[PDB]
RNA sequence: AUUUUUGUGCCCAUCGUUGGCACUAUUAAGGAAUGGAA
């Protein structure tokens, strides 16, 4: 009903007093120690739980009753922990012993499920519990009764309390004899006497009866056919009746001798920290077997045979590496579905091969076999190709033990075995979620939490002014209570930290009366709406000039804070105690993270949609649709009504020389001015040309490295992809030299380290560049493998392995930590591509806002969403890291600002979609086709279209809409497919241009495998031009902006009623 | 309550002209693809 985010903000702790700081440091400690046995504890507490406690309670979201009791009654921990293990056997038995009844088959799953053999086993909590009333010699009965009402308060099970609610029942209600009517109604009875007023039909007994409505029914007749003495006993006898905690008393006084004396602050803040884990994953591991059998049990388990011969060619000889590292397998190798097309070709050519065999089927020539041999992989490797151009690429490779074993098992059964491979082979392997406490941290809130308040801006400069300071100093203040070791009270003490990002988001202060009015959103950010460009004055100019290197950075975002509030272009900031100190310390340095809560009603009518395609193979394209449109263009889409706003593509320029250089979209600068670093690489090359290779066929062919090396190495080429195309290269020449495996030390490290423009010097955010880090660390590996090995092949039982790479490192600890280093930036460089991509979706999602009204995101990943029912694999997995985290980013960025709203989306295949043309009111595919110079065509483009227009029969619905436009094509120019047909490349653009100058026209266009040039009912780009195509008219447009608006229609109506 | 030398990151043939940017924290596991064009 509500959105609830808050936001975190992290920052330096300033250190202060060593003595001081000391003293905060111990206060941690001791609290460190004394959560921990509330965990061990309270895992007691879970351990001893009871069908009939469980009675009535319900409220379990599809929840086996059995089941919840198993994950409450022992758990899996760490080998050597406090209680005592169990076996993987008795298991069973053992719920089957407590509850009286084999376990269900949801509680069957959880003992089933996979986890570490080598440093967990699972713990029988119910054992600690019967040992819990060893010590303590509580009541069985008694304990069972105090349990009992824990139950009810949600203190055990799921859906627990507040921390200090849950301590405020336990340890709480603080009075010595001050119960609901003890010192009130207990001395009324005395002030009767008091007052001496005849105690007889006093108005305020009637009252609670009045007020509130046998006994109680004979108070309504009290006179009106004055006794009161009866209502005392039944008071007494009726107080009686009720009953509370019993067994409590000996536990807190326990966890004194432990813990030490209680404080709800502290007894309370130690338990939220320790039973955060327990919760947690409980909720989680219930969680994740309530779907673990989900697809398990549905899930098809029977074609083992399929799937183990499937990967017999990860142990054939087609698998041939370095790493020697089994990748998963999936549909997605070989085209999936579309790998069955091709299977007939292979046989049909094989059956000739084996006819051509019979004819000539003697001892003389067996270079018809090995010619047979070499033609199959090309058909492979176009096939792979081809398949891939549009859609990754199946392995080619793997391809060859996939036929090998052609009379072994069937097409479809492979089919079905990769499918039921993909799933048991990883979706199985997810482990336990075992239940350990990990490092704590706690927080310090406004109230109803541990005692702790920031610093006030306005006592900031309030408090500033008794001690004659600057009226502003860059560090944040604030003050909490803590509690002295030594000395056992309840003090307090002031600390500050300097979170820059938060002096200007919302710390600075604006003095200036009259400033501007806080934004909505209550953040100093861009996005938001404040510049913060404020014009740098004459001494800021001085005092971030003149200032040293390192913090030379940090200054200037100093001076510029200053200024606006100078300038009065701070805008103000609204305040309360809405901010939450976290404090975790770890050895003698303390992380303190401070974020506040975010609320804001939902923009359920939205009159705009905006999808997005974070793809990591194509370039990224933002499109927002207007919702009940009403216009001069508007489209009827299932009768509802709605016109494209805008379309264009997510850029992220970065003033440089004044020159926008798009982080995305870089791929490196142009040769001319990378020759000498070009020329050391290519120096490096001449010695070690020599190297074997393979024929497209398979016939292994060796070949100069330097002639591949000279075709990448042109001005015109960039760097980045150079760089790549170099280790791949690299990767390869080193292979043909094992020998040499540690003569490519130095230049690896000038390539990626030491070198003018390396790698790691300089790193672009284009899908080709995270390409060099992945290529990179290949390369780095692939160099260890063959560096690191033993002379004689096929010898000592099969070879051995690589020493993992912990005793694998030893060999050049330098190698080593480069990789680490390199890995290193790729995160935080893949990061920052996530976090970015989302300032600029929300800002155009945002800005959209602005001009049209509340908006939807509308976006391609699969969410922990509800798929029960039926799921398609395809769509399965087409989001990698990008697309996934942007999305969940942009779901968390959404919570924010007020009419945004972010919708997850099974992922799909459109790429021919057409806008507002599919599924309106019928489905409707087009081709990909693109569009060149007739001077400039190559033989793949003449036999590309060769390829759809061949009179070749497919049931498989698929490359149907190529065929058309290869039709399209000739019809479209009036042609014939035998008017041209083996006539090159020269004698073929010589045609187009007769037929071009006759319409006066240019660089014609056709339909392509994987284009950027799509032919669309209605004008999704603004440089989009428009042609007649067949006789009709379509809008010319880049492919990359079309799929976003498909992305945006894709079950749209779903969100309008 | 005075520290006044820093919250975390990203981009570049010219690491600076005030170069140009972006971000919610711990934690958890895992983390399969030889493509460049203002």
Known sequence: ????????????????????????????????????????????????????????????????DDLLLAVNWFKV??????????????????????????????????????????????????????????????????????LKLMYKEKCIGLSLSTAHYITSVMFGTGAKNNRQTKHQF??????????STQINSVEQLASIILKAGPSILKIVQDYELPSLIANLKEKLGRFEYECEWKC??????????????????????????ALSPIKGMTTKNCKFVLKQIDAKNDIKYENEPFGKIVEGFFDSPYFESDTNVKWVLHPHHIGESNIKTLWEDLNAIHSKYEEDIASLSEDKKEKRIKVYQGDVCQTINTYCEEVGKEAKTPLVQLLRYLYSRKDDIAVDKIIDGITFLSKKHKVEKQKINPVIQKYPSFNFGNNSKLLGKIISPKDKLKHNLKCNRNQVDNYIWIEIKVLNTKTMRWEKHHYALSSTRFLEEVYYPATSENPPDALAARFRTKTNGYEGKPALSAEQIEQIRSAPVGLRKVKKRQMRLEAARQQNLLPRYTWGKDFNINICKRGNNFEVTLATKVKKKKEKNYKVVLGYDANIVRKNTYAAIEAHANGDGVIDYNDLPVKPIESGFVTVESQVRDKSYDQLSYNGVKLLYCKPHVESRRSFLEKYRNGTMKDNRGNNIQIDFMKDFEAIADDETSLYYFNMKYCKLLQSSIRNHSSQAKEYREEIFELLRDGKLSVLKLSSLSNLSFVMFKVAKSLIGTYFGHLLKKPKNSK???????????????????????????????????????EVIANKIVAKALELRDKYGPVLIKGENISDTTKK????????????????????????????????????????????????????????????????????????????????????PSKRPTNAYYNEGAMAFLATYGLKKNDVLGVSLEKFKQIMANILHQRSEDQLLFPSRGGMFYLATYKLDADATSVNWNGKQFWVCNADLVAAYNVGLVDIQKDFK
């Open 1 to 64: 009903n509500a959105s609830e985010t808050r936001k975190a903000y992290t920052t330096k702790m300033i250190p202060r007093s060593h003595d001081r700081m000391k003293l905060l440091g111990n206060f941690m400690d001791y609290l460190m120690d004394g959560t921990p046995i509330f965990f061990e504890l309270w895992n007691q507490f879970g351990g001893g739980i009871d069908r009939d406690i469980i009675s009535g309670t319900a409220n379990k979201d599809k929840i086996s």
């Open 77 to 146: 921990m760490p080998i050597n922990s406090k209680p005592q293990g169990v076996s993987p056997s008795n298991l069973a038995n053992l719920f089957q012993q407590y509850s009286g009844s084999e376990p269900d088959i949801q509680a069957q799953e959880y003992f089933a499920s996979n986890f570490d053999t080598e440093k967990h086993q699972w713990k029988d909590m119910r054992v600690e519990y019967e040992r819990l009333l060893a010590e303590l010699q509580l009541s069985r009965s008694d304990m069972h009764h105090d």
């Open 186 to 195: 207990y001395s009324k009875v005395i002030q009767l006497l008091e007052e």
């Open 248 to 273: 409590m008393e000996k536990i807190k006084a326990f966890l004194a001798s432990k813990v030490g004396p209680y404080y709800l602050g502290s007894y309370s803040a130690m338990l939220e920290n």
């Open 796 to 834: 000592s039982d099969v070879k051995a392995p690589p020493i993992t790479d912990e005793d694998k490192q030893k060999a050049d600890p330098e190698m080593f930590a480069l990789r680490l280093a390199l890995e290193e930036k790729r995160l935080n460089k893949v990061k920052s591509k996530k």
């Open 869 to 952: 029912g039926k799921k398609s694999s395809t769509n399965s997995f087409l989001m990698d890291w990008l697309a996934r985290g942007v999305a969940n980013k942009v779901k968390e960025m959404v919570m924010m600002h007020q009419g945004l709203e972010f919708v997850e989306v099974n992922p799909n295949f459109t790429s021919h979609q057409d806008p507002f043309v599919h599924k309106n009111p019928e489905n409707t595919f087009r081709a990909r086709y693109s569009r060149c110079t007739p001077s400039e065509l190559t033989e793949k483009n003449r036999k590309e279209i060769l390829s759809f227009l061949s009179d070749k």
